[PDB]
Amino acid sequence: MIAHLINTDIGNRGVLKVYLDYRRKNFNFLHNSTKMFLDNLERVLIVTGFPIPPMMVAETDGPPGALAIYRAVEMLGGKAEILTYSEVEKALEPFGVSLARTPEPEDYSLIISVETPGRAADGRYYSMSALEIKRDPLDGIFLKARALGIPTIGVGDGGNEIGMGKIRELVVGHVPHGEKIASVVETDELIVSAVSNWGAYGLVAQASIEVGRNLLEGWDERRVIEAISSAGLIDGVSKTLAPSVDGIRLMVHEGIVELLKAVVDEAIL
Amino acid sequence: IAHLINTNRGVLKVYLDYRRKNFNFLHNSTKMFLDNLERVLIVTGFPIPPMMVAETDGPPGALAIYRAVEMLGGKAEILTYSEVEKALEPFGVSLARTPEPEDYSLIISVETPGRAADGRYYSMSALEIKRDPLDGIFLKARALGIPTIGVGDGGNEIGMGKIRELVVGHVPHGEKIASVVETDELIVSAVSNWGAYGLVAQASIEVGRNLLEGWDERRVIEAISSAGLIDGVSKTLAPSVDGIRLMVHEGIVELLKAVVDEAIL
Ligand SMILES: [Ca+2]
Ligand SMILES: [Ca+2]
C-alpha cells in the first residue's frame, strides 16, 4: 500500500515513530486526503518552499512534489497555481507552471502545502536542526483558509511543516527539538511521509488508483531533481548543490517513484 | 528496511502494531543472523489447501538468505517439501537430510506453517492444512536454546507465536489460524519473501556490502513457477506471489538495493 511505502524506513526514527502513531489512529489518512483532493479540483493553490538556515535558500524537497500534484490536477481537468519563493519559481520555470499572484484563499477550491514551514508554538519558524528561519512566511494563507472553511491538505516529513499542528503532540514526543520546532498550523487533512516529495507522489498515486489512470506516468524524478538543483535549490540536509533530497541520493527517490508507478498500474489492472 | 517490507489490510495493521511495540525487530533479527552463520538451517514451504501444494511465497526469500549466508562465509541447508526441492534444484542448494536441531548454529523459517492453539495447521482462509509438518524442529530448537528467526506475513507461520495477541486482533480467522510457535526473533512483512530480502538488506548495511546485488526476482519466480510452485492466493501457476504481479516485486527489490547502497555509501 501507498501510505506505507511513502514512509519507507530511511533512518529518521523520529518521523517513523510519528507515522506509526499517526497511522494507528488515522489508518486511512492517505485515502481521506485523496478524497478531499478529488472533490476540490476546480482551482488548486499549491504552496511550497522551505528556506534552509543559515543561507535561507529554498531546498529540493517540496518543489518536485508540488510539480507532480500540479501536473495531476491539470490532467484531471482542474486548474492549479503555485505559491512559492523566487528561486523556486525560477527552478520550475522550464516546466511552465502557473504562478499565483496576490492570492486570496477564497479564490481557490483547495489549498495544498508541500514542505512549507509552519509557525511553531512561539510563533517562530524553525528548521529540523532547530535553527530559526529568517524570511517572509507562507503559512498565513492557511490560517485564513481555515477561518474561511476552505479545504486544505498538508504534506510534511519533519514536523515543522504546515499541517503538522494536527499532530503536534506526536512531534513534540518523537522528534528531536520537537517542542521548539513543531508547527501549530493545522490543515483539514494531513499526509506524513519520510520525504515530502514522496508524500506528494503518494497523493498522486492514491488519486490515480481512485480514478483508474496512472497520473504519475511520465514523471522523471532524476530530470526534475537535476533541473531544480541546477537552478540553485539546495539539499536541505547537506545544504549543498547536490542533486539529492534530504541527504538521500537519487536512486532511492527513483526507486520510490518506480515502485509507486508499478503499484498503481497493478491496482488499475 | 523494516518498514518498506510491510507495504492485506489485516497484516498491515499487525505490522504497524508490531513495529510500534518492538521498534528494532529487523535490526535484532539481523544481529542474531550475523552472529550465527556457521551452519544455518533454512526452513520454508507452505502447503495451500485443498491441493496441499507448496507456493511461491517462501522459497525465493529462503534462496536469498541461503545465498547471503554463503557470501558471508557460512554454510546453509534447506529443509522443505519435495516439490520445493525440485523448484530450487536449478540453484544447487544443499538439502537437509535427517536434520537434528543441535547440528545448526541457527534455524530460520521463511513462510512455513506453524501449529495453532489447537495443534492443527490452517491457511489464511481458515482451511486446514493436511500434510506432514515442518515446525517440529523449532520447538526442539527453542527448548535447546538454538537461535531461531521466523519470517511471515499472515499470522499462521512459524514464529508468529511471539505476537499471537496482535494476530487475533487484526487478522480474519485470527483466533483459529494464529500459530503459537515462537522463535527468538520475528520479522513481519507484507509478503514473506520481502521480509527475507529485508533481512539480507539489513545484513548488507551491517557488513558494508550489498548482498542483494545480482538478485533477479523475475528469473527466480518464473523458475519456481515453472517447476510447479503455485501462487498462494490465486492458487494457479501464474508467475506471481500472493496475488501480486512480478513488477511490484521487482520494484520492492530494486528499492531495497538502493536503500542498501545509500547506507553503504
Ligand atoms: Ca524534508
Ligand atoms: Ca504469504
Q: Which domains does chain A have, with CATH numbers?
A: 1-269 (3.90.1640.20)
For the record, the C-alpha cell of A26 comes out as 488515522
Cα–Cα dist B189/B15, whole Å: 7
State the distance from the centre of ligand 2 to the C-alpha of B171, rounded, in angstroms. 13
Task: Give the Å distances, CA to CA, from B255 to A60, A65, A254, B188.
Answer: 20, 19, 8, 18
Q: Quick check: B65 and B108 in contact, CB under 8 A?
A: yes
Contact A11 B255 (CB under 8 A): no
B116 at interface of A, judged by CB pairs closer than 8 A: no
| DSSP assignment letter at A192 | E
Contact B17 A9 (CB under 8 A): no
| B132-147 exposure pattern, b = at least 16 Cβ within 10 A, e = fewer | eebbebbbebbeeebb
Cα–Cα dist B254/A31, whole Å: 26
List the beta strands (DSSP E) in B58-211: 75-79, 106-110, 148-152, 185-188
Residue A5 pairs in a beta bridge with: none
Side chain identity, residue B191: V
Cβ contacts of A176 within 8 Å, gap of 6 or more? A14, A128, A130
Confirm whether residue B83 is marked as ligand binding.
no
Q: Cβ contacts (< 8 Å) between A23 and chain B: which residues?
A: 16
CA R_g for chain A: 16
Q: Quick check: A38 and A103 in contact, CB under 8 A?
A: no
Question: Looking at CA atoms only, how far is residue B36 from chain A in angstroms?
Answer: 26
Cα–Cα dist B107/B78, whole Å: 10
Measure the CA dihedral B197/B200/B206/B210, to 10°: -90
3-state secondary structure of B264: helix
| DSSP assignment letter at B197 | H
Look at the block and give the residue holding cell 519558524: A125
Q: Quick check: B146 and B107 in contact, CB under 8 A?
A: yes
Cα–Cα dist A67/A88, whole Å: 11
* Count of pairs with CB atoms under 8 A, one residue in A, one in B: 75
For the record, the C-alpha cell of B109 comes out as 523459517
| DSSP assignment letter at B129 | P
For the record, the C-alpha cell of B7 comes out as 507495504
For the record, the C-alpha cell of A160 comes out as 515543522
Cβ contacts of A168 within 8 Å, gap of 6 or more? A121, A182, A183, A184
* Beta pairing class for B240-241 and B75-79: unpaired
Look at the block and give the residue holding cell 507562507: A138
State the distance from the centre of ligand 1 to the C-alpha of A246, rounded, in angstroms. 6
| B77-104 exposure pattern, b = at least 16 Cβ within 10 A, e = fewer | bbbbbebbbebbeeeebeebeebebeeb
* Beta pairing class for B39-44 and B106-110: parallel
| DSSP assignment letter at A98 | P
Write out residues 178-237 of B within 8 Å (CB-CB) of A: 190
State the distance from the centre of ligand 2 to the C-alpha of B105, rounded, in angstroms. 26
Cα–Cα dist B101/B39, whole Å: 11
Give the ligand at the shortest distance from the Cα of B193: 2
Nearest by Cα to B248 from B77, B57, B118, B29: B57
Sign of the torsion formed by the C-alpha atoms of A252, A257, A258 and A264: positive
CB atoms near residue B218 (< 10 Å): 13
Look at the block and give the residue holding cell 524524478: A221
What is the stated resolution of the deposited model, in angstroms?
A: 2.0
3-state SS, A232-267, equals: CCECCCCCCCCCCECCECHHHHHHHHHHHHHHHHHH
Q: Cβ contacts (< 8 Å) between B2 and chain A: which residues?
A: 9
Cα angle for residues B107, B108, B112 (degrees, 5° grid) = 120
Q: Cβ contacts (< 8 Å) between B261 and chain A: which residues?
A: 249, 251
Q: Quick check: B113 and B130 in contact, CB under 8 A?
A: no
Give the ligand at the shortest distance from the Cα of B160: 2
Contact A258 B258 (CB under 8 A): no
Task: Give the Å distances, CA to CA, from B24 to B114, B130, B260.
Answer: 23, 35, 17
Search chain A and give the residue with CA nearest B17: A24
| A99-120 exposure pattern, b = at least 16 Cβ within 10 A, e = fewer | ebeebebeebebbbbbbbbbbb
Q: Cβ contacts (< 8 Å) between A157 and chain B: which residues?
A: none
Measure the CA dihedral B55/B56/B60/B66, to 10°: 10
Q: What kind of experiment solved this structure?
A: X-ray
Side chain identity, residue B98: T
